[PDB]
C-alpha cells in the first residue's frame, strides 16, 4: 500500500491500481471505497471518483506523480457519493466522464453532478459499444439492479480482474450493507450475471472490502438469496 496524503493506492497489475478513500460517515465510522486506475498504452482510464472532489484532485495528483500520462476518460459505477462524488475534480482537470444514463439522471437529486456522457446498454447488459467510444480494455456490463438500480461493472481486457463496485462484497462478508436504494428481489441474479460476464476473472475488486477470489461473487449472492 501507498499512503498518499489521505488515500491509498495499491498496484494490482502492470498497468492497473486500485485507489481508495474515506469517508467519515457519522453512525459508522470512516468508510474506505475502492475504484481503479488503468493504463492504457499512452492514456490513463479512472473507475469511480473518490467521496470528494479534493479526494479525487489527489487521485489525479498521484496519477500525474507516479504513471505521468493524461487521464483519457473516467467511467463512474452509480450515482452515490463514493462513487460520483468528485466529478467536479474531474471535469475541472479536463477529463471526458461517463456513467450509465440511469446513474446521470438520478445524479441531481442523490446530490451528485452528473458524468458528460451517458452509457446505454444492450438487453443482455453489454454496453452499447457507441456509447463507450475510446474504452480501450474497459468491457462495461449493466448486471440488472441491485445495489442500486442503476449499478454497472467493469472488466479489464489483457488482466485477470474485474471490478463490482458495490454490488460484489468480499467472501467473508456478515452483510450486504445499506439496502436503502436495492432491488431486493433481484440482487442475487444481478451479482451472478455479473460473474457470468466475466467468467474468466480471479480477481474480484469492489468498492468497499480488498479484492478477492471469486468466492466473493458466489458470497454475494448467496447472502442476497435471503432477501427474497
Ligand atoms: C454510502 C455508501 C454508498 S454505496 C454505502 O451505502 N455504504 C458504504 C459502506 C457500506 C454501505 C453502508 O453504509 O451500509
Ligand atoms: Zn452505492
Ligand atoms: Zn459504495
Redesign the pocket.
Known amino acids: 500500500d501507498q499512503r498518499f496524503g489521505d488515500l491509498v493506492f495499491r498496484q494490482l497489475a502492470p498497468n492497473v491500481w486500485q485507489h481508495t478513500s474515506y469517508l467519515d460517515?457519522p453512525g459508522?465510522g470512516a468508510?474506505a471505497?475502492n475504484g481503479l486506475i488503468v493504463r492504457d498504452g499512452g492514456r490513463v482510464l479512472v473507475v469511480d471518483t473518490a467521496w470528494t472532489d479534493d479526494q479525487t484532485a489527489q487521485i489525479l495528483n498521484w496519477i500525474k506523480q507516479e504513471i505521468n500520462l493524461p487521464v483519457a476518460l473516467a467511467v463512474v459505477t452509480?450515482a452515490?457519493?463514493?462513487?460520483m462524488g468528485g466529478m467536479d475534480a474531474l471535469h475541472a482537470a479536463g477529463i471526458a466522464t461517463y456513467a450509465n444514463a440511469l446513474s446521470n439522471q438520478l445524479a441531481p437529486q442523490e446530490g451528485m453532478v452528473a458524468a458528460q456522457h451517458s452509457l446505454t446498454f444492450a438487453a443482455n447488459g453489454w454496453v452499447e459499444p457507441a456509447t463507450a467510444p475510446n474504452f480501450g480494455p474497459l468491457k462495461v456490463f449493466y448486471p440488472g439492479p441491485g445495489?442500486t438500480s442503476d449499478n454497472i461493472t467493469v472488466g479489464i481486457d489483457g488482466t485477470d480482474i474485474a471490478f463490482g463496485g458495490?454490488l460484489i462484497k468480499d467472501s467473508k462478508a456478515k452483510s450486504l450493507?445499506?439496502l436503502?436504494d436495492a432491488d431486493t428481489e433481484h440482487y442475487a441474479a444481478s451479482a451472478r450475471a455479473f460473474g457470468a460476464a466475466f467468467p474468466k476473472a480471479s480477481m474480484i475488486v469492489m468498492?468497499?472490502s480488498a479484492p478477492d477470489s471469486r468466492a466473493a461473487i458466489t458470497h454475494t449472492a448467496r447472502m442476497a438469496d435471503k432477501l427474497r
Open positions: 460517515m459508522f468508510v471505497s452509480h452515490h457519493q463514493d462513487k445495489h458495490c450493507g445499506n436503502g468498492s468497499h
